[PDB]
Design a protein around this motif. Structure first.
Motif, PDB file in Angstrom:
ATOM      1  N   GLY B 107       0.796  -1.217   0.000  1.00 30.09           N
ATOM      2  CA  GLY B 107       0.000   0.000   0.000  1.00 30.09           C
ATOM      3  C   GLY B 107       0.831   1.270   0.000  1.00 30.09           C
ATOM      4  O   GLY B 107       2.057   1.265  -0.105  1.00 30.09           O
ATOM      5  N   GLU B 108       0.128   2.391   0.132  1.00 28.89           N
ATOM      6  CA  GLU B 108       0.746   3.693  -0.082  1.00 28.89           C
ATOM      7  C   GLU B 108       1.551   4.200   1.110  1.00 28.89           C
ATOM      8  O   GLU B 108       2.299   5.162   0.956  1.00 28.89           O
ATOM      9  CB  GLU B 108      -0.329   4.715  -0.472  1.00 28.89           C
ATOM     10  N   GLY B 109       1.446   3.587   2.285  1.00 30.66           N
ATOM     11  CA  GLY B 109       2.295   4.029   3.378  1.00 30.66           C
ATOM     12  C   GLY B 109       3.769   3.727   3.187  1.00 30.66           C
ATOM     13  O   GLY B 109       4.581   4.160   4.013  1.00 30.66           O
ATOM     14  N   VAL B 110       4.128   3.007   2.117  1.00 28.22           N
ATOM     15  CA  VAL B 110       5.519   2.646   1.856  1.00 28.22           C
ATOM     16  C   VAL B 110       6.322   3.898   1.533  1.00 28.22           C
ATOM     17  O   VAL B 110       5.885   4.750   0.749  1.00 28.22           O
ATOM     18  CB  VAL B 110       5.611   1.631   0.706  1.00 28.22           C
ATOM     19  N   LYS B 111       7.480   4.027   2.166  1.00 21.57           N
ATOM     20  CA  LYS B 111       8.433   5.098   1.894  1.00 21.57           C
ATOM     21  C   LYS B 111       9.710   4.518   1.309  1.00 21.57           C
ATOM     22  O   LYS B 111      10.226   3.504   1.796  1.00 21.57           O
ATOM     23  CB  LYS B 111       8.762   5.888   3.166  1.00 21.57           C
ATOM     24  N   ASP B 112      10.227   5.186   0.282  1.00 19.35           N
ATOM     25  CA  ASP B 112      11.444   4.757  -0.396  1.00 19.35           C
ATOM     26  C   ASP B 112      12.655   4.968   0.511  1.00 19.35           C
ATOM     27  O   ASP B 112      12.996   6.111   0.846  1.00 19.35           O
ATOM     28  CB  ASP B 112      11.593   5.542  -1.706  1.00 19.35           C
ATOM     29  N   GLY B 113      13.321   3.871   0.885  1.00 19.33           N
ATOM     30  CA  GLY B 113      14.450   3.962   1.781  1.00 19.33           C
ATOM     31  C   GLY B 113      15.811   4.138   1.129  1.00 19.33           C
ATOM     32  O   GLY B 113      16.814   4.177   1.843  1.00 19.33           O
ATOM     33  N   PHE B 114      15.876   4.273  -0.194  1.00 22.00           N
ATOM     34  CA  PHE B 114      17.157   4.354  -0.895  1.00 22.00           C
ATOM     35  C   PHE B 114      17.976   5.557  -0.439  1.00 22.00           C
ATOM     36  O   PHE B 114      17.445   6.652  -0.234  1.00 22.00           O
ATOM     37  CB  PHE B 114      16.920   4.438  -2.406  1.00 22.00           C
ATOM     38  N   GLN B 115      19.282   5.360  -0.298  1.00 23.40           N
ATOM     39  CA  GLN B 115      20.187   6.464   0.012  1.00 23.40           C
ATOM     40  C   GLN B 115      21.486   6.290  -0.756  1.00 23.40           C
ATOM     41  O   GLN B 115      22.161   5.264  -0.622  1.00 23.40           O
ATOM     42  CB  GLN B 115      20.469   6.548   1.511  1.00 23.40           C
ATOM     43  N   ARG B 116      21.849   7.296  -1.542  1.00 15.08           N
ATOM     44  CA  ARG B 116      23.128   7.245  -2.223  1.00 15.08           C
ATOM     45  C   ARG B 116      24.260   7.223  -1.209  1.00 15.08           C
ATOM     46  O   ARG B 116      24.124   7.709  -0.082  1.00 15.08           O
ATOM     47  CB  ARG B 116      23.302   8.455  -3.140  1.00 15.08           C
ATOM     48  N   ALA B 117      25.404   6.697  -1.643  1.00 10.98           N
ATOM     49  CA  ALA B 117      26.612   6.653  -0.837  1.00 10.98           C
ATOM     50  C   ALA B 117      27.689   7.631  -1.302  1.00 10.98           C
ATOM     51  O   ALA B 117      28.723   7.759  -0.630  1.00 10.98           O
ATOM     52  CB  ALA B 117      27.178   5.217  -0.842  1.00 10.98           C
ATOM     53  N   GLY B 118      27.469   8.344  -2.403  1.00 14.79           N
ATOM     54  CA  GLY B 118      28.535   9.071  -3.064  1.00 14.79           C
ATOM     55  C   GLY B 118      29.281   8.183  -4.043  1.00 14.79           C
ATOM     56  O   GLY B 118      29.149   6.961  -4.054  1.00 14.79           O
ATOM     57  N   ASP B 119      30.094   8.816  -4.879  1.00 11.41           N
ATOM     58  CA  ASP B 119      30.803   8.070  -5.903  1.00 11.41           C
ATOM     59  C   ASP B 119      31.791   7.103  -5.270  1.00 11.41           C
ATOM     60  O   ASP B 119      32.295   7.326  -4.168  1.00 11.41           O
ATOM     61  CB  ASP B 119      31.552   9.019  -6.837  1.00 11.41           C
ATOM     62  N   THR B 120      32.049   6.007  -5.967  1.00 11.90           N
ATOM     63  CA  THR B 120      33.212   5.194  -5.658  1.00 11.90           C
ATOM     64  C   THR B 120      34.375   5.728  -6.482  1.00 11.90           C
ATOM     65  O   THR B 120      34.304   5.756  -7.717  1.00 11.90           O
ATOM     66  CB  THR B 120      32.966   3.723  -5.948  1.00 11.90           C
ATOM     67  N   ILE B 121      35.424   6.174  -5.797  1.00 15.46           N
ATOM     68  CA  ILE B 121      36.554   6.834  -6.437  1.00 15.46           C
ATOM     69  C   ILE B 121      37.818   6.012  -6.214  1.00 15.46           C
ATOM     70  O   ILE B 121      38.273   5.857  -5.074  1.00 15.46           O
ATOM     71  CB  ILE B 121      36.745   8.257  -5.905  1.00 15.46           C
ATOM     72  N   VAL B 122      38.422   5.555  -7.306  1.00 14.44           N
ATOM     73  CA  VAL B 122      39.684   4.830  -7.268  1.00 14.44           C
ATOM     74  C   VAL B 122      40.701   5.677  -8.016  1.00 14.44           C
ATOM     75  O   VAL B 122      40.477   6.043  -9.177  1.00 14.44           O
ATOM     76  CB  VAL B 122      39.552   3.425  -7.876  1.00 14.44           C
ATOM     77  N   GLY B 123      41.788   6.035  -7.337  1.00 15.14           N
ATOM     78  CA  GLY B 123      42.769   6.909  -7.938  1.00 15.14           C
ATOM     79  C   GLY B 123      43.608   6.171  -8.952  1.00 15.14           C
ATOM     80  O   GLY B 123      43.165   5.183  -9.552  1.00 15.14           O
ATOM     81  N   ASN B 124      44.834   6.648  -9.125  1.00 15.72           N
ATOM     82  CA  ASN B 124      45.765   6.180 -10.131  1.00 15.72           C
ATOM     83  C   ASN B 124      46.763   5.205  -9.523  1.00 15.72           C
ATOM     84  O   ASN B 124      47.153   5.334  -8.355  1.00 15.72           O
ATOM     85  CB  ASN B 124      46.507   7.375 -10.736  1.00 15.72           C
ATOM     86  N   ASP B 125      47.159   4.221 -10.331  1.00 18.59           N
ATOM     87  CA  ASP B 125      48.231   3.292  -9.978  1.00 18.59           C
ATOM     88  C   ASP B 125      47.829   2.475  -8.759  1.00 18.59           C
ATOM     89  O   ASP B 125      48.614   2.271  -7.826  1.00 18.59           O
ATOM     90  CB  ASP B 125      49.557   4.017  -9.740  1.00 18.59           C
ATOM     91  N   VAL B 126      46.575   2.074  -8.744  1.00 18.44           N
ATOM     92  CA  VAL B 126      46.010   1.269  -7.662  1.00 18.44           C
ATOM     93  C   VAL B 126      45.939  -0.189  -8.105  1.00 18.44           C
ATOM     94  O   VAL B 126      45.517  -0.494  -9.232  1.00 18.44           O
ATOM     95  CB  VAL B 126      44.629   1.806  -7.242  1.00 18.44           C
TER      96      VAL B 126
END
Ligand SMILES: C[C@H](CCC(=O)NCCS(=O)(=O)O)[C@H]1CC[C@H]2[C@@H]3[C@H](O)C[C@@H]4C[C@H](O)CC[C@]4(C)[C@H]3C[C@H](O)[C@]12C
Ligand SMILES: C[C@H](CCC(=O)NCCS(=O)(=O)O)[C@H]1CC[C@H]2[C@@H]3[C@H](O)C[C@@H]4C[C@H](O)CC[C@]4(C)[C@H]3C[C@H](O)[C@]12C
Ligand SMILES: C[C@H](CCC(=O)NCCS(=O)(=O)O)[C@H]1CC[C@H]2[C@@H]3[C@H](O)C[C@@H]4C[C@H](O)CC[C@]4(C)[C@H]3C[C@H](O)[C@]12C
Ligand SMILES: [Cl-]
Ligand SMILES: [Cl-]
Ligand SMILES: [Cl-]
Lengths: 220, 218, 219
Positions: B107-126
């Motif tokens: 039913g309509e009482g459902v609330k969307d629980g999604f939450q972004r985490a921010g980008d996954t960032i991998v630098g150089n020479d990893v």
């Protein structure tokens, strides 16, 4: 063309109660497996070494095995891709015997003793979220409301509303003890479906005390 | 695409293969995935909208902005390493239930629980070892090494070696030499200078690498 | 289809199957690989030159000598356990970059960063749990037990139980009894004596096994 897989996208989940067939598995309402990234159904990929599954069905129905450890899963559980339930106890390997090797009578004669030992049932309580590629070892009980981290290796019982990662590391409890105790009395997963629907606005929030009041007025 | 691996002797250049608009990967970074069969986008990067099974729904323009996977230059990503995207995937440990109730079922009482985490960032020479899992929103600084089977949920400082459950074993060089590598940034040099300095890069001589930079790169 | 596991009741005898010259495995040791499908040499042993994808390359001789995988007798290897070979795979943490620059792409200044780790040695009567990962160079002593999903990077002493990130949980027996087992080495007995002692081997009566050794085996 290649052989089909169990899931068409990771947006899809499989309701377990309508699917599961192994008499040695019990799964409660709404619990689902979202298994896209590991290709196969819950019973062929996630639940392992449980007599009576697809590869051992004919052997199991001969009735010469006796009782085995069962896998019991509650209601409202979220099981992520590649999560694994290890069944069959020690699989015949006795750390307390001189050898862990499972000598066959065919190769080593009539002196062979069977070292199989049951570990007891694997129980997952209600409202339990099990992250991707976690491995649940034989005999553990995971209490209601727990969260098992991705890749966790669970070999001990998990207290209700615990968050556990890695090598049985409890990193926090989701709520204070008093509120945990409250959720364990009212047991919203056991309410009639219309009451869960009616309180859905509270369940999609942190207001346990509102939930406890709805219980007092309406459920009892 | 689904170009496979013929043997574990071969890696796949990532910048030339990846098509997901939510993935950025720099020059020379590769995936050596023979032992896990499928492509980097199919097997290693998980739950990222815009991939193969969700390209239709993403192109429909419904979700807005999702967390991206950002990967720098000269990274080595071993078979079965995994990047977990899509945030909490709708499970909120701070709400009463973690269950993702569907509207058509509850039913309509459902609330969307999604939450972004921010980008996954991998630098150089990893260097990311086999079957490591990188959880949402983690930053991995330049020159870091992720042990095989590591489960990474916290940011990883540049040039640190991390294994297991976020266990920092050590840093690859002394603090001053790390700082020198982070200023000179050899991974951004014109290719001719990387080639010319290749005999230094294949050594521990960081200060001789800095001498080269001062005199030829500037 | 013949190499396939039909069910998880089925184990594959390794000495009768393994063909890689760089793998040695002792009598009776087996791989129970139903839940990861492929054979021991295809799925468990990784990055060992002379396997199926690299046989023709290894036939030439370009490489010389590599770290071998040595497994003793009466070892029980559960599904998806993995032996990581090929040492550092050419990644040098002590060099400025770990990136394995190819000569076609970066020219003649490229130096080979490959370093051997030493052979991977699994002893006798070792049980390796499902999806454990054994890293290059590791010695696992006789009678050891490697938990499911363990990641082993350090040597494992005889009869120790190891889980997680090299976590030593316990030793299976008291030190003196371990010493007795490392002397008598029942895994090396003539098969007649292993059969005759099966009733003892399937129990915790180490001192009775020693009595058998003294009275019937002892050289
Ligand atoms: C496939 C998963 C389970 C689906 C399911 O079977 N639910 C049963 C609920 S009920 O008994 O019918 O109430 C669902 C659960 C949560 C879903 C995620 C969450 O809804 C959050 C976002 C929402 C976006 O629309 C798609 C990506 C996504 C990250 C979803 C992907 C995927 O569909 C998930 C992960
Ligand atoms: C598959 C891996 C990556 C291949 C790749 O795509 N490299 C890109 C370099 S570049 O942009 O073209 O400069 C390569 C990198 C390091 C290689 C390993 C190292 O070269 C060390 C040895 C060398 C032997 O010839 C083969 C086994 C081996 C253990 C190699 C196996 C495999 O070919 C590796 C692991
Ligand atoms: C597939 C495994 C290994 C088979 C094998 O290769 N044996 C060789 C021994 S020998 O050189 O012929 O002496 C065997 C070893 C132990 C077996 C388990 C143990 O025997 C305990 C029970 C016994 C039940 O009959 C079936 C389930 C089960 C849990 C067995 C399933 C499976 O057949 C196992 C796990
Ligand atoms: Cl999920
Ligand atoms: Cl690699
Ligand atoms: Cl086994």
């Amino acid at each position: 063309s290649n052989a089909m897989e169990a899931f068409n996208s990771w947006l899809e989940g499989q309701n377990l109660k309508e699917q599961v067939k192994n008499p040695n598995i019990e799964v409660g309402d709404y619990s689902y497996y979202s298994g896209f990234y590991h290709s196969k159904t819950f019973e062929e990929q996630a639940v392992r070494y449980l007599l009576g599954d697809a590869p051992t069905q004919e052997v199991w129905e001969s009735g010469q095995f006796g009782e085995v450890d069962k896998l019991r899963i509650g209601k409202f559980c979220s099981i992520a891709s590649g999560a694994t339930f290890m069944m069959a106890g020690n699989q015949g390997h006795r750390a307390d015997w001189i050898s862990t090797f499972p000598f066959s009578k065919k190769e080593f004669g009539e002196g062979v003793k069977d070292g199989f030992q049951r570990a007891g049932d694997t129980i997952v309580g209600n409202d339990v979220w099990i992250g991707s590629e976690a491995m649940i070892m034989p005999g553990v009980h995971i209490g209601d409301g727990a969260i098992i981290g991705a890749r966790a290796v669970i070999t001990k019982n998990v207290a209700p509303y615990s968050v556990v990662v890695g090598n049985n590391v409890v990193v926090k409890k989701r709520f204070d003890e008093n509120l945990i105790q409250t959720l364990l009395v009212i047991k919203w997963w056991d309410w009639p479906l219309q009451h869960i629907k009616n309180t859905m606005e509270i369940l999609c929030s942190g207001h346990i005390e509102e939930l406890e009041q709805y219980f007092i007025k309406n459920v009892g």
